[PDB]
Write a protein that binds this ligand. Structure first.
Ligand code: HEM
Ligand code: HEM
Lengths: 199, 199
């Protein structure tokens, strides 16, 4: 990821906001010299991505985690709303398409987490608490969780560096920008809500 | 990515289908020993992901491509529909949440593509052709494209290995599965359309 100045985060709290709202992340490591990636839920501990702690889990049957033992640097990609921008929307005669999106990339040293129960319980609360209705583990779910523990591996990442991208057509003139926003308001309201949060 | 047997592709053409329908991919390489990822449009050449050719582009100002010169192995992640599965939907007393999703991971040797114009023109056709209405570069767009060439770097990947995941609650019993599907039909019809394509 290269962040063009025009597409940088406007306020530094928008990164944590994206990360909290889009926990189904991509966890990436360099198994040998080749990237390997797992789709896993990853939550944030603290106010800032930068310098905070990420917590996640994956299947013990997924051999990816066996590569975390040496504590290599890992990259975690959080992806927010995204949408293709067609020149059909622009209605100008010379144009070129693009893709609008928001993402946060966090890099740091990974570590296997011994308290897998904490991790998965915190992840539940993270996903269920904003929902309506929210789900709270009944006491038998808590015992069920314990029975699932042998099959899960939890990990943590101390974020060394963080990069945020908010590529939301801000480089567009007034008229073309309005067209882009109103099409996403119809088609993709999460993306349109972010182009308001960018003004 | 580890693909649990129960979540494997049912027909081997579902991978190419996902890749064609979700071209906004994540291109991942091991800059030094650390993963670096760029969100870029990537299209498929041929009938099969496995053994086919991926084509993509990114900004010349994005230094990521400078790492492709040695032709390292790269990983390209295509992400289809996905959705959180809350135990609230299950309405059973012991349960644990999960995330349903479809993805294709393709690994191979990357190469800088000298015909960037072909690549970007093929990508336009890929994105616009299924749309309604489709956009066809006017002749002045084709000249505009040429003026943009200095700012773009195109690349290609010959797919050495491919992995597909269709994690779509197939391990669910009859009753719980129905509840999961009808909630996504309301909330997430792309995901629900895939759980039909899995039966
Ligand atoms: C809070 C929301 C949760 C979500 C979104 C979620 C999601 C997931 C996902 C996507 C995987 C696959 C990882 C991979 O491919 O390696 C997985 C694996 C697993 N998780 Fe979670 N999980 C949640 C909570 C929990 C809880 C509370 C437990 C309790 C211990 C748990 C235990 C497990 C187990 C045992 C597996 C492996 C299953 C298998 O072998 O197929 N998860 N989970
Ligand atoms: C077909 C649909 C297309 C999509 C979805 C698309 C999308 C994108 C994206 C997401 C980037 C950012 C890459 C990065 O972060 O490094 C980019 C960069 C770029 N692409 Fe495309 N593109 C398309 C077609 C084209 C065409 C036809 C051209 C003509 C040459 C072109 C030229 C460029 C240029 C010049 C840049 C760099 C812009 C900058 O420096 O900010 N693209 N494109």
């Amino acid at each position: 990821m290269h962040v063009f100045p025009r597409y940088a985060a406007a306020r530094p709290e928008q990164a944590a906001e994206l990360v909290r709202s889009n926990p189904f992340a991509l966890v990436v490591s360099a198994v040998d010299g080749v990237p390997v990636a797992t789709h896993a839920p990853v939550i944030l501990e603290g106010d800032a991505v930068e310098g905070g702690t990420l917590l996640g889990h994956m299947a013990r049957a997924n051999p990816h985690w066996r590569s975390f033992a040496s504590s290599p640097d890992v990259l975690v990609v959080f992806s927010g709303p995204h949408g293709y921008v067609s020149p059909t929307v622009y209605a100008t005669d010379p144009a070129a398409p693009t893709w609008d999106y928001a993402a946060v990339h966090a890099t740091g040293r990974v570590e296997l987490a011994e308290d897998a129960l904490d991790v998965v319980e915190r992840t539940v609360a993270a996903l269920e608490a904003p929902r309506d209705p929210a789900w709270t583990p009944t006491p038998a779910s808590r015992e069920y969780f314990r029975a699932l523990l042998p099959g899960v591996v939890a990990f943590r990442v101390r974020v060394r560096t963080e990069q945020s991208m908010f590529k939301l057509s801000q480089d567009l003139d007034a008229e073309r920008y309005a067209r882009v926003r109103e099409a996403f308001a119809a088609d993709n309201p999460g993306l349109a809500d972010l182009m308001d949060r960018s003004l």
